[PDB]
Amino acid sequence: CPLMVKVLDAVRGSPAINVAMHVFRKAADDTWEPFASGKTSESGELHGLTTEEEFVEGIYKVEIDTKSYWKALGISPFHEHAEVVFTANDSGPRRYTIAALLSPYSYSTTAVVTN
Amino acid sequence: CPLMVKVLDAVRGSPAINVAMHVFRKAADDTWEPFASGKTSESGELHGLTTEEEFVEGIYKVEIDTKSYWKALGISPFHEHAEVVFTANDSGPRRYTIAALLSPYSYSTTAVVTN
Amino acid sequence: CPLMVKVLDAVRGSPAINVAMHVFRKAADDTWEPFASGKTSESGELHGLTTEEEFVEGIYKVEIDTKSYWKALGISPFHEHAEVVFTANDSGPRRYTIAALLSPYSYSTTAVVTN
Amino acid sequence: CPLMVKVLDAVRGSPAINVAMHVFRKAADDTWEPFASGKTSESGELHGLTTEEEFVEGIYKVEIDTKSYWKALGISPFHEHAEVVFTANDSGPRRYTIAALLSPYSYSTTAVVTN
Numbered sequence: 353c354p355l356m357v358k359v360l361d362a363v364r365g366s367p368a369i370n371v372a373m374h375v376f377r378k379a380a381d382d383t384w385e386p387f388a389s390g391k392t393s394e395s396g397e398l399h400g401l402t403t404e405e406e407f408v409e410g411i412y413k414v415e416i417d418t419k420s421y422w423k424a425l426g427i428s429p430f431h432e433h434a435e436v437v438f439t440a441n442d443s444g445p446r447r448y449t450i451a452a453l454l455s456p457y458s459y460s461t462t463a464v465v466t467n
Numbered sequence: 468c469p470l471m472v473k474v475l476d477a478v479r480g481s482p483a484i485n486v487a488m489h490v491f492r493k494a495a496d497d498t499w500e501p502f503a504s505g506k507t508s509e510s511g512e513l514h515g516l517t518t519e520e521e522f523v524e525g526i527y528k529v530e531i532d533t534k535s536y537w538k539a540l541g542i543s544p545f546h547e548h549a550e551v552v553f554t555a556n557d558s559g560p561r562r563y564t565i566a567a568l569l570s571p572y573s574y575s576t577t578a579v580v581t582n
Numbered sequence: 583c584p585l586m587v588k589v590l591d592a593v594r595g596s597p598a599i600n601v602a603m604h605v606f607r608k609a610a611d612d613t614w615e616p617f618a619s620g621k622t623s624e625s626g627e628l629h630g631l632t633t634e635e636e637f638v639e640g641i642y643k644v645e646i647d648t649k650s651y652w653k654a655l656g657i658s659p660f661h662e663h664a665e666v667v668f669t670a671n672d673s674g675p676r677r678y679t680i681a682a683l684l685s686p687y688s689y690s691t692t693a694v695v696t697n
Numbered sequence: 698c699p700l701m702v703k704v705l706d707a708v709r710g711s712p713a714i715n716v717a718m719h720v721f722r723k724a725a726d727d728t729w730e731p732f733a734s735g736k737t738s739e740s741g742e743l744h745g746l747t748t749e750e751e752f753v754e755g756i757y758k759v760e761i762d763t764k765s766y767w768k769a770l771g772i773s774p775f776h777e778h779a780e781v782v783f784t785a786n787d788s789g790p791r792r793y794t795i796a797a798l799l800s801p802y803s804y805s806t807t808a809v810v811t812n
């Protein structure tokens with residue numbers, strides 16, 4: 353599993369469950385092409401987005417639909433979504449964990465990259 | 468000044484100086500129309516981006532060129548840029564400050580909305 | 583003003599107003615000697631804590647009463663307080679800003695050290 | 698395992714390995730009594746600090762020795778340590794994960810609390 357995402361809720365102190373996200377990859381004509389999508393599980397994790405063979409070098413974008421998450425809790429948040437954009441596998445295959453910590457008016461994102 | 472940006476550097480504990488950013492407004496065709504841009508000052512701040520008359524309700528994207536900032540310091544970063552996408556809504560008088568705290572493999576962004 | 587504190591609220595996207603804090607300096611017997619205190623202003627800031635003459639090298643602790651802040655808003659928090667412990671070292675002229683970003687189950691703290 | 702700690706390094710995008718920490722519990726005479734200690738593993742995690750029977754209601758403090766971590770990497774950081782203080786098990790037994798994301802001049806801490 354070369355690309356995993358983990359989402360936490362800073363207001364409830366819990367994993368952020370059922371958060372939708374879409375992954376895009378920048379194509380040669382400079383447009384974002386759909387690559388994968390899913391929702392976080394009861395542990396706030398989304399696994400199995402791609403495989404090592406499919407996850408080639410490129411620029412990738414992960415859009416995390418945080419607005420729908422907060423709205424379903426009755427909160428009207430600041431951000432439309434959290435956006436994480438990065439170059440992947442530029443120096444060979446790696447495993448990427450993208451983490452996001454969510455509050456209504458603030459979020460953080462970090463990456464753990466292992467070889 | 469209805470919209471200001473502040474950028475900080477969590478590695479050196481200083482304002483992030485000379486950071487370039489563009490602001491976009493979402494159009495009817497779901498494309499990003501460039502709206503404003505600048506570089507942060509010696510205090511890590513960017514003012515004068517828009518006016519009250521021009522800053523109408525809509526979805527806005529602030530794209531912060533964090534990769535060039537870290538490259539200038541000789542540090543290999545994870546993200547291509549830091550992206551802040553938000554819905555601007557007229558709920559009374561409101562001035563927006565977007566803050567971003569930068570590390571090579573992590574960033575946080577917060578909004579302070581005051582009257 | 584060699585030492586200032588700024589406190590923000592990540593749930594409401596506003597300065598954290600009326601937050602109490604104490605500052606301690608570590609003594610020779612490893613006890614915490616109270617040094618200064620105050621409450622944050624309408625801008626979420628606390629100034630005037632110390633002077634250059636008094637703010638000597640040493641280890642300092644800023645203890646921010648975040649629990650009472652969330653309790654006043656009717657929100658059950660995780661932390662008893664937010665604690666910032668740091669070594670102050672004379673490396674040229676230096677003014678310290680301690681920032682803290684608060685959520686019910688999470689906090690971040692940053693230092694901006696400038697000349 | 699009712700108390701686990703996870704530490705990440707925001708500069709290298711990796712778990713923070715070999716980070717020491719000490720856990721204290723506030724005694725009836727208002728002093729901090731030693732409770733448990735350990736170092737994070739190759740995955741940045743510290744497990745097996747306590748058991749459900751030993752981990753009674755009380756106020757607990759986790760001191761994470763971040764200064765020694767950065768110093769061993771050649772960085773001179775701002776903070777002496779990261780301090781997390783909280784009331785545990787006030788409404789019955791819970792499982793606590795304390796997470797810390799570290800940069801030289803900034804850190805965040807979050808708690809995931811499950812039943």
Ligand SMILES: Oc1ccc(Cl)cc1Cc1cc(Cl)ccc1O
Binds near residue numbers: 576690
């Ligand atoms: O608005 C201000 C003003 C001064 C400072 Cl120093 C930090 C912030 C915001 C901020 C604080 C923290 Cl603790 C983390 C990330 C942030 O953007």
Ligand SMILES: Oc1ccc(Cl)cc1Cc1cc(Cl)ccc1O
Binds near residue numbers: 451703797
């Ligand atoms: O990956 C995990 C798994 C469990 C937990 Cl509890 C926190 C993180 C990362 C994290 C920590 C902090 Cl302190 C802030 C934002 C984060 O994504």
Ligand SMILES: [Ca+2]
Binds near residue numbers: 556557558
């Ligand atoms: Ca309206």
Ligand SMILES: [Ca+2]
Binds near residue numbers: 671672673
């Ligand atoms: Ca000295």
